[PDB]
Amino acid sequence: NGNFVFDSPISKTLLDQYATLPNEFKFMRYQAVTCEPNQLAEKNFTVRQLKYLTPRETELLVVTMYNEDHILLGRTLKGMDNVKYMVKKKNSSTWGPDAWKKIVCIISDGRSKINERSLALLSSLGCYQDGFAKDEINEKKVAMHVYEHTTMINITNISESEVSLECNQGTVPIQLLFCLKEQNQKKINSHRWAFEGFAELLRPNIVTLLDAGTMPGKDSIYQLWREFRNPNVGGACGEIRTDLGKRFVKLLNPLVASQNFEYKMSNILDKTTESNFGFITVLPGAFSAYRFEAVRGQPLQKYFYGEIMENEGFHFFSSNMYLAEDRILCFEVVTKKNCNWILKYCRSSYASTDVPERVPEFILQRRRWLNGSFFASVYSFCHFYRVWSSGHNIGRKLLLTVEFFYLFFNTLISWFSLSSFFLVFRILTVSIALAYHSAFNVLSVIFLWLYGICTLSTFILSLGNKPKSTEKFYVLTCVIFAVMMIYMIFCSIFMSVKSFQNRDIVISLGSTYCLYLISSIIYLQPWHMLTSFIQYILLSPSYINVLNIYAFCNVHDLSWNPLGKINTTEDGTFKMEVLVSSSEIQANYDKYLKVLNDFEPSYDEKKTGYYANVRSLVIIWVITNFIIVAVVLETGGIADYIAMKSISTAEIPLMTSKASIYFNVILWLVALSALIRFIGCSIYMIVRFFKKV
Amino acid sequence: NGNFVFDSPISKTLLDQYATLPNEFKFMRYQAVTCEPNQLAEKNFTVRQLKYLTPRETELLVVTMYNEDHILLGRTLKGMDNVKYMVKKKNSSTWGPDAWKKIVCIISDGRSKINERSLALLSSLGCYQDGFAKDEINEKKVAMHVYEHTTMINITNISESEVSLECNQGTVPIQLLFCLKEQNQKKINSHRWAFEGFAELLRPNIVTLLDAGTMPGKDSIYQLWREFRNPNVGGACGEIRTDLGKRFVKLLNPLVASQNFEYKMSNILDKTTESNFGFITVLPGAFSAYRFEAVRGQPLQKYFYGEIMENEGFHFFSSNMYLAEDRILCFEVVTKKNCNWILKYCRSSYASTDVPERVPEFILQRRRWLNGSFFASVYSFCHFYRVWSSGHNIGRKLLLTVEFFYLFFNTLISWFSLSSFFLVFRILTVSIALAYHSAFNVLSVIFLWLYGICTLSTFILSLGNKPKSTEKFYVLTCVIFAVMMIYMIFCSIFMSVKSFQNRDIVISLGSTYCLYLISSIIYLQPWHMLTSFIQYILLSPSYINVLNIYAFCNVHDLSWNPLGKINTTEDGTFKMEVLVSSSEIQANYDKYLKVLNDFEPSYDEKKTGYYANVRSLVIIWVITNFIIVAVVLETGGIADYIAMKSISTAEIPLMTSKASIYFNVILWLVALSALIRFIGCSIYMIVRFFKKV
Ligand SMILES: C[C@@H]([C@H](N)C(=O)N[C@H](C(=O)O)[C@H]1O[C@@H](n2ccc(=O)[nH]c2=O)[C@H](O)[C@@H]1O)[C@H](O)c1ccc(O)cn1
Ligand SMILES: C[C@@H]([C@H](N)C(=O)N[C@H](C(=O)O)[C@H]1O[C@@H](n2ccc(=O)[nH]c2=O)[C@H](O)[C@@H]1O)[C@H](O)c1ccc(O)cn1
């Protein structure tokens, strides 16, 4: 039909296990796509599911990959376990002995970057054969290499070294569909291929987004698909668990134990609370599910292209919304016009992913998350009236409004954290010295200077340099801040012990831990509340001061005729035309005489200019935090101003009463959020328990 | 001789004026160079001067150009006036009726960037004809297009619009030699072509470096050549005067009046004082002269290549000396082994250049000068022992040692200026409020906050952004600092008036102006001491705080198979070889099975890493200035520390006595330098007067 397709046989060694035979199993199809992802249908491209005597009707998985090795891809593919569980499911109206026919997509990204040890595994499965890729077809550049087949072998064990494949009477067929882009176009393009391309052909019911390296549990995909029984749910997500290795031998890295605790409390407290209202801020791209009908239309338009209505110039939201990439989908689904979709959190389905283990990789990873969450929250709050233009009933609309206000309260608290941390630190360290005089004077001065030097260097290195160039310094900074936090804990314990012997710093901070602990107990998963709490506490002054500074200082990732030839022989003789005619010489001379007598750059450069002027206006964050510091501590010359006024009608005081008032406000304002999230987690568990009963 | 040369005739219209005839005048020579600049001789390349019956012996001009229009190049070429003066010179042993035969080079830089309205002028002179450039010759890429001729027409007037050429009995011949590089290789390459190339062929006596747009006076080149009568002088330079337009109608821009005053005091005070000792730190590249024998060897090696002795890794001086580009020549000439060359300043020869007129262009220009001077001074001080290994007598060696120590004292004063300015500002503004209470409290706080915000924004914008993107902000910053300086002057005048009615701020600062004025009077050029003093005073808080911050924050200018094809007919049928043999399929499958079973980047990136780690260690300047601020004002928690100590055996004081002591030290330390430079200028003028008498 004007398109290039090919159909090769597989190696007879595969046939040896396959016999232990239809046209689906013995052959593979290589369609080569050259068009745009949004044209597969009208360019006469098909897939094997639409070719049979009765076309197959798909019920359910996109696995994005870039350069992951074969162990990560093996883990994702092994998590085949879900498909096997779903065929062996007996008492069901949707799944049964032939369930695999209703489940189908591995989107690679560029041939140069792909790890050929993973192409090895894809070929072992039988979904790729080298030899017949075609880098252009009839003056049209190929864009996609689509291999398809239907294997019989399953990954059954994964050591640290090898992936074990087998083909028995107990394995189940898998309808693989391997897409190979010839070039890296970033993840958004891959999702573009998955949603605007093959999803329009297959017409699935649910689209589940996995991520190479993420291993769903033995039932997790089934438990996620069960969330969509409710005809209102539009998206869903499950728990993401840090992979702690064999014998939990990766819970030693303090950067991995920190992330384990952080993920675990994010799931227990934040996600259940959000799911009560009906709008989860981010559905993780490593393990999420969308009802296809829910996202078609406005959500995908906003995700892939952006706010289309725009002039030639740049606008804030329209030209910056690309920084909140996969979080636009959630907001546009929940607030869709004339539809009542909601987002649900399923805690019965988990997936264990791999986390960064070195400080530079970790910083670069969180640079994306922090900018995405900040821009997404600003967009959600500045556009929350859309909630009232949607189709929900009035109760749900009120709940969503309350949740949006609570989420903005949280983002504001997080914006003022640079100053909250310093103020708590300096108020506490000066107060202990004023109380006891012994050696806390010198430590107060020393720690002020250490904080100042580390913060100065973090601004300078993040604005100018790159984390890979200077890793020793970032490790040293994290160690310095850990020691500072230890000193803060010692000071609080000392002050409280002496005060008891002779106060609210224990009634508020103790509640936050007791409430954290009780929420973990309610969730029936408390084992992180001791193995990894200390690392989080110690690596927490660095999540406030190093990841935030780097995140805001690197918002946008800026990036600032042949008129002759002479060939001669060994002798060196040749000739060409020479402008011999003196009239033409005079003509050229008069041309230059008259030339003497006749007395914005690229859109890319203009866009880079705009992007770099918006990264430099958000940092100048610093002023609004210093305003708080100056008001409370009376820095900035304000105390001098008050003293001079008193003289006009004197001496400056060491520590004032604004410090006490503020340092109470922060402790109770951080106890309040823990209280709210504990109540939310309790409601979630209780409602789930009644519905299960 | 294996090289491509060509010899075209000129237009007969030129012949019309030339008649009003030898082979030098009627023809032009286009040699095309493809080799390296240091190979012109042994590759059998010549110039017309070596071809005559008796080869010409050159006595004396390289004019670097990039994209200057035809007015600037016209001005440089007009300043032909010097050659005419030198032929009409009667009573001389070197110059006479045929002096032009001893004077010869215009080094363009790339055909793409050259302003074709200047190619118009070069063709009007008769030294370029389009039609026979050859972009490659016998598998060798052309590197240089060398046109040569010997004109008769002279530029006699330059309006704002046109350049007036004429050919009479009164004009004089000029031996032009137009070099056109096919690509931009930066100025260092052009000087490489000028010195290592054509200068080895011509063997001149003096090499004078002009720069397109700079117009030497009617006698300036002759007066510069006269400095080399002394067989010890190795280099020389003249005064550079800002071009103030017709009717001085450019002395209105405050950025141009500032630069006029700055250039004028640099010439009067700095350069005469340096020339007394015998070592001028920078000979400006816009108008300088070097005795060719003086610079051959070590100076040119260090200028063009660098400290050759080096390992694979990077070292500070060896790998950063390229930032001090034309200042290495001076240091290496003066301290040359077994030679007693000195550098001399000639005030009888001037040249009027064009200056930047918008803040972004000005900032980008001074970014080069400040980094160059800082690295050159560090290199000169860290290597000053070389002075004692040279050939000078002991008196000159002692004088050079004293001068080197004085120059390091100056560079240290300039390194601590960021803190000196703030300390003077805050001590003065707080002191006036403590004295009079009226409305100086509020102004003290307001100006502290304005200073803080402008300095924060200058760090952030210079570390992240570019000056062209944000020009409104830099203009606003300069205005803010001008207002601050006005307030500083008001405060000092008010305090002094009240103190006289009831002190050293007038005996020191008044001396600095009286000494500036007296030096200008001695120099017989005082007219800048009123037309442009106010602009310099007001635009001076910005030379300390905006150009220095930008200069140190931008030290180094960082910059971070086809395996198929298918063509078919309209029907779409074709065939190629297919790996049909199943044995080869099994072979490939086993190849991937075994692939599964088998379980630093570019030198440019490493160099960029090193460069960006050295720009980030020099800024972290900030700490050593803040140490001074903290010691004097008792910021940084030191005053709190003292108060807590006093309690351990209380209240903080507003203003202490360290402020008074420091604020005396700065005023007298800035009066001392003015005194030294006044004495130096006086010695220079007096010695020149006796030698002239
Ligand atoms: C981040 C995620 C996982 N560790 C991961 O790395 N995800 C990548 C990503 O987020 O970009 C995926 O993107 C693909 N990719 C990369 C470069 C490219 O150029 N194109 C392209 O497609 C990569 O191969 C990879 O599969 C982690 O588990 C997680 C996420 C959310 C959460 O709440 C908790 N945990
Ligand atoms: C700066 C100088 C003059 N205004 C100027 O602009 N000099 C350029 C420079 O310093 O680079 C020259 O360099 C050439 N150039 C440029 C780009 C390139 O890529 N390659 C290349 O050769 C340009 O054409 C130009 O002639 C000014 O008068 C001055 C200097 C010192 C001083 O004490 C007082 N005043």
Numbering used by the authors:
A (entry chain B), B (entry chain A): 382 to 401, 409 to 448, 450 to 468, 470 to 494, 496 to 893, 912 to 969, 977 to 1015, 1025 to 1045, ...
Paper quotes:
The overall structure of Chs1 reveals a dimer architecture with a twofold symmetry and is ~100 Å tall and 110 Å wide. Each Chs1 monomer is composed of a large cytosolic soluble region and a transmembrane domain (TMD), with both the N-terminus and C-terminus in the cytosol.
Nikkomycin Z (NikkoZ), another peptidyl nucleoside inhibitor of chitin synthase, has shown significant clinical benefits in mammals against pathogenic fungi. In contrast, the peptidyl moieties of PolyB contain carbamoylpolyoxamic acid, and NikkoZ contains hydroxypyridylhomothreonine. In contrast, unlike the flexible GlcNAc moiety of UDP-GlcNAc extending away from the active site, the peptidyl moieties of PolyB and NikkoZ extend toward the chitin transport channel and form extensive interactions with E457, D602, A677, and W760. Therefore, our structures suggest that the peptidyl nucleoside inhibitors inhibit chitin synthases using a unique mechanism: the nucleoside moiety competes with UDP binding, and the peptidyl moiety induces the switch loop open and blocks the gate of chitin transport channel.
